[PDB]
Homo-oligomer: A and B are copies of this chain.
Amino acid sequence: SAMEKTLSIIKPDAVKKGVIGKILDRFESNGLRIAAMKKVQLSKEQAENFYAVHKERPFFKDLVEFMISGPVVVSILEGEGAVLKNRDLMGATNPKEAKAGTIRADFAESIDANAVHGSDSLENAKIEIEFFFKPNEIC
């Protein structure tokens, strides 16, 4: 399915570094089209809603303050195996363990400031895309 879609977030650390274009190019150079995209500032409540599953752990507060500490760029990436391809391009969550040439190897400072988010399954991609985008934004 050449029309598989997944959610990408370029997080506030990478936005502040000014590497939005370099990160987007990793996607477009590797068979993924930017189907939708906007730069947005999340409120505390919005980051809390998006990450409600981590309401669980100690690191929730820190995750939220980070995710609202500046603007992010949210995108729908579309293409064959988009969900897994995005994850492959992002690299392991720990930048120290991320393979060479991955976004997190190249641009991430630490586990906590790890540059990018990507949906981790088709199910979650559907939920995360709906959270950010109305159908008319997908063009």
Interface of A with B (CB < 8 Å)?
18-29, 33-34, 36-41, 71, 73, 137, 139
- CB–CB A39/B34 < 8 A: yes
- CB–CB B22/A21 < 8 A: yes
- List 10 interface pairs A-B (beta carbons < 8 Å), by A numbering: A20-B25, A20-B34, A21-B23, A21-B29, A22-B25, A24-B24, A38-B39, A39-B137, A39-B139, A71-B139
- CB–CB A25/B34 < 8 A: no
Copies of this chain: 2
Measured in the bound complex, the distance between the Cα atoms of B27 and A26 in whole Å is 17
Closest to A26 in B: B21
Measured in the bound complex, the distance between the Cα atoms of B25 and A21 in whole Å is 4
> Which residues of chain B have C-beta atoms less than 8 A from A29's C-beta?
18, 21
- CB–CB B38/A37 < 8 A: yes
Measured in the bound complex, the distance between the Cα atoms of B38 and A19 in whole Å is 16
> Which residues of chain B have C-beta atoms less than 8 A from A27's C-beta?
21
Measured in the bound complex, the distance between the Cα atoms of B25 and A41 in whole Å is 21
Looking at the assembled complex, report how far the CB atom of A15 sits from the nearest CB atom of chain B, in whole angstroms: 8
- CB–CB B41/A38 < 8 A: no
> Which residues of chain B have C-beta atoms less than 8 A from A73's C-beta?
34, 37
